[PDB]
């Protein structure tokens, strides 16, 4: 219920946005669904989706080279393969699995920069998402700043299109969801809030002003998938987020869809 979401905001001293879609019943759950939050690393799953839209699977095998000049921070994978390169597909995988920022930037470049990413989303009917900056400055999350923001409803709708809709053919959907499964960056968020026998493919987000997000497609054992977007932020630039907000918001969603 909305009462539960509201209490969570107060419990954790945070602003919360939620949109969820049970694709089995087309039933939805919403909480501040059209309010803007910095999307932070959650764009990586969607941009990987755009990459898949615009490239053959064979194209993912191409080697991309880059140098120490190209590295930004939060890049554990790319900093390791600097100089000798990685495949395009390995790049997308790094962004999605390790939230690798340099990988995110290379992904951006491959689909035409933040504005190429925005354009592809516009083409899918998303007129809400604003993508303006590369990593790592897109995580700035200044209150009232529309740059690099979206809403739980817009993000969730995009994710549904990519992972359980017609934005990708089935084989490419499968590559995307595989990339999104089994990643540690997801452990304290949606995955922590749903039963252990559910399968969770997610992409996490963390930014300034205590921005803490998670989006996912999840499968209860005997059901069609549920698409979830949960975004959050705080008043102070240097605020510390609490993963439990996200996990508990997810339990609320599970219970509502029981």
């Amino acid at each position: 219920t909305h009462k539960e979401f509201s209490q969570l905001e107060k419990k954790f001293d945070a602003r919360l946005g939620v949109y969820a879609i049970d694709t089995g019943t087309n039933q939805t759950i919403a909480y501040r669904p059209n309010e803007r939050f910095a999307f932070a690393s959650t764009y990586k799953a969607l941009a990987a989706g755009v990459l898949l839209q615009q490239n053959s699977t064979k194209k993912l095998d191409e080697v991309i080279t880059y140098t120490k000049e190209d590295l930004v921070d939060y890049s554990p994978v790319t900093e390791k393969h600097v100089d000798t390169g990685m495949t395009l597909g390995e790049i997308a995988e790094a962004a999605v699995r390790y939230s690798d920022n340099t990988a995110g930037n290379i992904l951006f470049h491959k689909i035409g920069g933040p504005k190429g990413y925005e354009k592809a989303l516009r083409q899918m009917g998303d007129r809400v998402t604003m993508s303006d900056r590369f990593e790592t400055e897109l995580n700035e999350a200044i209150p009232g700043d529309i740059r690099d923001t979206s809403t739980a409803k817009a993000i969730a709708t995009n994710l549904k299109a990519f992972t359980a809709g017609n934005a990708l053919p089935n084989h490419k959907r499968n590559i995307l969801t595989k990339w999104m499964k089994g990643n540690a960056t997801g452990d304290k968020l949606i995955r922590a809030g749903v039963p252990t026998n559910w399968v969770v493919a997610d992409k996490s987000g963390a930014g300034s002003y205590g921005t803490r997000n998670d989006i996912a497609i999840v499968w209860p054992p005997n059901r069609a998938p549920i698409i979830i977007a949960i975004l959050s932020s705080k008043d102070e630039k240097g605020a510390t987020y609490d993963n439990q907000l996200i996990a508990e918001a997810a339990e609320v969603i599970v219970n509502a869809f029981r």
Binding site: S41, T67, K68, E69, L71, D73, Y74, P76, E79, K80, D83, S99, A184, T185, D187, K188, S204, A206, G238, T240
Partner: protein, 271 residues
């Protein structure tokens, strides 16, 4: 340590979420990319994502440990002069050479490399793609301190800095000032630090203000540490932080006894 403070970075793997068991009575902390380690009463504790086995603690680390260090995928401990290593090993960073299995006085980890200081001699193993584990002849005697970076390593000999590995942003070009009187060194990904009689000296990349050392850290500093793209200094129990928009929160404005910088997460031990 009365308490422990961890802050900064995305904390995407929980590397900055210190568990209760490591909240107090901690002697030291070591920060890796996906994990953290603490040394408490001779026992190695750890937290984070155990992606590579770096949190799978060898029985020997359960007591009598003297020091710890951590890289991207691996963990190191020093016990009775023997270097103990575990976790990811694709570059040979956990394959401890016999020479480092006794008599070792200090250890340090690079991102994919491990270092030991034995009777003044730096011993290095693991990745050598950027020359970081080829020890300069000069660093093979009279060394008193050392540290590993991402693509680099650093040592202090006769109070002068020795630096090797990648030099893309000039991070291993040692300034005149750091060639005598230096007590300690710390390497970032693209910058390096030295501590000279309480004055922090920084060189290399400054695109993210890494080498823009704050005035407060120009004297009276007792300790330094470096993450990838930020740095820390300890001064009369107060932590000074700079680079990549890092700040020191009010919790570390006093009563800090030691500092540790993981690649992204900073740690402060309080007395």
């Amino acid at each position: 340590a009365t308490s422990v403070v961890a802050w900064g970075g995305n904390n995407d793997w929980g590397e900055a979420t210190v568990p209760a068991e490591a909240q107090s009575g901690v002697d030291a902390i070591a920060g890796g990319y996906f994990h953290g380690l603490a040394l408490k009463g001779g026992k190695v504790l750890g937290w984070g994502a155990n992606l590579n086995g770096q949190l799978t603690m060898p029985a020997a680390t359960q007591s009598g440990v003297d020091a710890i260090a951590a890289g991207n995928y691996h963990s190191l401990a020093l016990k009775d002069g023997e270097v103990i290593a575990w976790g990811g090993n694709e570059d040979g960073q956990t394959t401890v050479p016999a020479e480092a299995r006794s008599g070792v006085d200090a250890i340090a980890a690079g991102a994919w490399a491990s270092y030991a200081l034995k009777d003044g001699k730096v011993i290095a193993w693991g990745d050598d793609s950027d020359g970081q584990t080829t020890v300069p002849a000069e660093a093979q005697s009279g060394v008193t301190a050392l540290d590993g970076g991402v693509y680099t390593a650093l040592a202090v000999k006769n109070g002068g800095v020795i630096a090797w590995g990648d030099n893309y942003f000039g991070q291993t070009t040692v300034p005149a000032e750091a060639q005598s009187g230096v007590d300690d060194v710390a390497g970032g990904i693209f910058h390096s630090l030295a501590l000279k009689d309480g004055k922090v000296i920084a060189w290399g990349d400054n695109r993210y203000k890494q080498t823009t050392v704050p005035t407060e850290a120009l004297s009276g500093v007792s300790a330094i540490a470096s993450g990838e793209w930020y740095s820390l200094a300890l001064k009369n129990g107060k932590v000074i932080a700079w680079g990549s928009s890092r700040t020191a929160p009010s919790s570390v404005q006093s009563g800090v006894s030691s500092i540790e910088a993981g690649p992204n997460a900073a740690y402060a031990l309080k007395g």
